[PDB]
Amino acid sequence: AEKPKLHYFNARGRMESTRWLLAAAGVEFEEKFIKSAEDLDKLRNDGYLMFQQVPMVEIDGMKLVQTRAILNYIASKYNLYGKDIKERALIDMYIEGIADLGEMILLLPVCPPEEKDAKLALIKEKIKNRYFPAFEKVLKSHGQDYLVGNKLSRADIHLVELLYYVEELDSSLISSFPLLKALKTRISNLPTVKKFLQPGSPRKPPMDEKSLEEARKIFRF
Amino acid sequence: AEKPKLHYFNARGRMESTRWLLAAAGVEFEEKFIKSAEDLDKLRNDGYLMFQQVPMVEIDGMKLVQTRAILNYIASKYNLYGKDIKERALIDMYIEGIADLGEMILLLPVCPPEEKDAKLALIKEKIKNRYFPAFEKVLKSHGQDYLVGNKLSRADIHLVELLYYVEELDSSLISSFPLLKALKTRISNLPTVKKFLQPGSPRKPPMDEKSLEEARKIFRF
Ligand SMILES: CCCCCCSC[C@H](NC(=O)CC[C@H]([NH3+])C(=O)O)C(=O)NCC(=O)O
Numbered sequence A, B: 001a002e003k004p005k006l007h008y009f010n011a012r013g014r015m016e017s018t019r020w021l022l023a024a025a026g027v028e029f030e031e032k033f034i035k036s037a038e039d040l041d042k043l044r045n046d047g048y049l050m051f052q053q054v055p056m057v058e059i060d061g062m063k064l065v066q067t068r069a070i071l072n073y074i075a076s077k078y079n080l081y082g083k084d085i086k087e088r089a090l091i092d093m094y095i096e097g098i099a100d101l102g103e104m105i106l107l108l109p110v111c112p113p114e115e116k117d118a119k120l121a122l123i124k125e126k127i128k129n130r131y132f133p134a135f136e137k138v139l140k141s142h143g144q145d146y147l148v149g150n151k152l153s154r155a156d157i158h159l160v161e162l163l164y165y166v167e168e169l170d171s172s173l174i175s176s177f178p179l180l181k182a183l184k185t186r187i188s189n190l191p192t193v194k195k196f197l198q199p200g201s202p203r204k205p206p207m208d209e210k211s212l213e214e215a216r217k218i219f220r221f
């Protein structure tokens, strides 16, 4: 009997794209925050984590690990995964490009300090020259307010989340991509997303060094 | 209309799981091998690669990039992705664990020499203590010949592929996992997989140093 229950630490990390997708879908959720290695070990010892890792989400009577398993379930359940197999292929292709870029941004702070400047420069180059051109071209191709099927899907949600992180890195990177700018505004004004973006929501801030320190202690790295 | 066409270099890399899945499904396909940077640049210049990367597969009148988009499409098309949303969530959880382990093995040879021994040691620990226990537990929980739904799915195929790679790493690692051993035998005896395992199929050999140098020249890393 439950709202979905999100098991993670109090940070974006690997859970934030799930927070975004549930919120976009209008689904209220609860979070159980891991604060210590001891908390993680309890989840493990109680049999809740198939591969001894989080994210884990309790939803519809079961316990799901692996970010993509969680996301795929939520997207299908709430009709955000397209209408057929071909639309799912477009969605998947798009969101896996988003994932590749998002992964780079997620792990930047765990890069060795002597590698960070080059890694950041590489991310900016890929945004400007690979990823933003590819999504701009999709929107330019059909002229529709959404990426796939002329209707909101998880692709729109995952992309606009990523546009917010790119803005935190360098607000100028989107400047030559007017359709991406317009998508960002449109998605951000949908009632459910607007509510998620407002202060006090479950949306999480950029990870600071204190949070990274907590991650290292919880996940033992 | 036409057979799927697989665009990659002549190696396992990120295309081999697609070769296994198609073969297991009984689907004949064609390969177009990239042999140099110039071949890759032609695919790029011709507009065929959304993110300027391969794998790319031409299937059912469309070009798909991103390994998971390709695999998801093929699995759905050939009824290897479960029967409903809950079975897909089990499949996705399982295969993303498999992916995590597979990725560690795939990238081992591009780890700096100074760190390879320690990375290999940690991969073997995770196999023995994390991943093989998790899959053995699944098979023991229901006593069924397949991981999900008592019928062949992509999870069985992706797992057994990985079991072949683990065998190449260290043939002792599976020894305390009799149900995984049994699964490897049963799946290997399915007519389509048996054929794929025999000589002269599209199955690719382990990547040797000369093939890794070719990857470096093609992909410019
Ligand atoms: C820079 C931010 C990093 C913050 C921590 C990373 S997420 C926590 C980590 N989980 C994973 O790595 C899960 C990977 C998995 N592929 C998924 O996406 O769910 C964990 O439980 N690690 C414990 C373990 O593997 O033992």
Ligand SMILES: CCCCCCSC[C@H](NC(=O)CC[C@H]([NH3+])C(=O)O)C(=O)NCC(=O)O
Binding pocket: A096, A100, B013, B014, B052, B053, B054, B055, B065, B066, B067, B068, B106, B107, B109, B110, B212, B215, B219
């Ligand atoms: C031991 C080395 C392993 C060799 C595997 C390299 S795969 C080739 C590489 N493609 C990718 O990285 C694709 C990643 C994508 N997430 C997917 O899974 O399809 C590429 O085109 N790279 C060119 C580029 O990104 O510019």
